[PDB]
Symmetry: C2
Subunit: 200 residues, 2 copies
């Protein structure tokens, strides 16, 4: 009633279609090319999209170990994000930032022990508190020459910090460690943004 | 030494390339079209393949609930696989087959309770034992008119039964229920093959 196509095609519209729509936002060229490529493929062989999606899901450990590597890597070259501005509080910002970025980058090796990891949560929370503590001090004293989109980034950092805490508290419900590594990595990118906005 | 391309592209060759190679076996047309589509896409935006793969992994619950549905469905229309051959042992085969296919199809609702599920493992093992018990009896008494690729299917059923047991014992190590639903579904297809080989 109220109306075709077989049930095995479901994941094309349930899984693949929402991927392409969020992909048309960043690169229409590829998103369009892939869209019709899958559509033609499913008309050829019904259920093929599922077979594809299942094979991707099977490489979970590969993707986990890849994101792990990606998070560890995302602490290298901190000398790229150092400020020229004088003097004391900006050095302190640079430290609190580097410190936090490192603590985060080393999560994939701390998440094994529950004893080590519960300490790291306390350790990250301390680095974030001391990070924002330093930011607001520059926001109160030093004259914000040429720029003040820094405030937007400070708010953006907060959004990614609470999101990190949310996925962290979700980890003690799911067991899905991958979401923690992605969220942690995301937070490092946000830290980098603030730092670069002090430069650019 | 011994040699390019960035690290974010890794999953294209680690995850996507092995998908296409196992896909060229079933449908070269689509596999080829998708291959170059992704390749062009990664040359455009480095890391896009990862973003795609991550979005697919996020729809895990969708894919789990889809495979669940697919397994329950895979017991419908058993009248399609009923034998014309006379008389008593073939009816018994049909029963032992239907019984097993149903027990399997109802796993996604039994896997919640550990008490119900450990019983189902015992219950499936009983249906398989009694299934093979019946097969060998037709293989010993009744004259195998026109066909005897049935023996190949009997061996193929066994291969998918031990594989089911293997992924089942892996479930008590992984917690990944999806592999159980896929393997169970696979075993139903094998059951159907034997039955259809008695017909065709």
């Amino acid at each position: 009633x109220x109306x075709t196509t077989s049930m095995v095609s479901m994941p094309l519209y349930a899984v693949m279609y929402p991927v392409f729509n969020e992909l048309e936002r960043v690169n229409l060229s590829a998103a369009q090319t892939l869209r019709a490529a899958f559509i033609k493929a499913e008309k050829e062989n019904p259920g093929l999209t599922q077979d594809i999606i299942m094979k991707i899901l099977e490489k979970k450990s590969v993707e986990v170990n890849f994101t792990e590597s990606l998070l560890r890597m995302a602490a290298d070259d901190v000398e790229e994000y150092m400020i020229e501005r004088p003097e004391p509080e900006f050095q302190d910002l640079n430290e609190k930032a580097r410190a936090l970025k490192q603590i985060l980058s080393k999560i994939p090796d701390e998440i094994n022990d529950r004893v080590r990891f519960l300490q790291t949560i306390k350790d990250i929370a301390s680095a974030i508190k001391e990070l924002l503590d330093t930011v607001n001090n520059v926001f109160k004293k030093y004259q914000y020459q040429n720029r003040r989109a820094l405030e937007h980034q400070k708010k953006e950092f907060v959004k990614y910090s609470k999101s990190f805490s949310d996925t962290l508290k979700t980890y003690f419900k799911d067991g899905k460690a991958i979401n923690v590594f992605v969220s942690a990595n995301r937070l490092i990118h946000q830290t980098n943004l603030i730092l670069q906005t002090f430069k650019t």
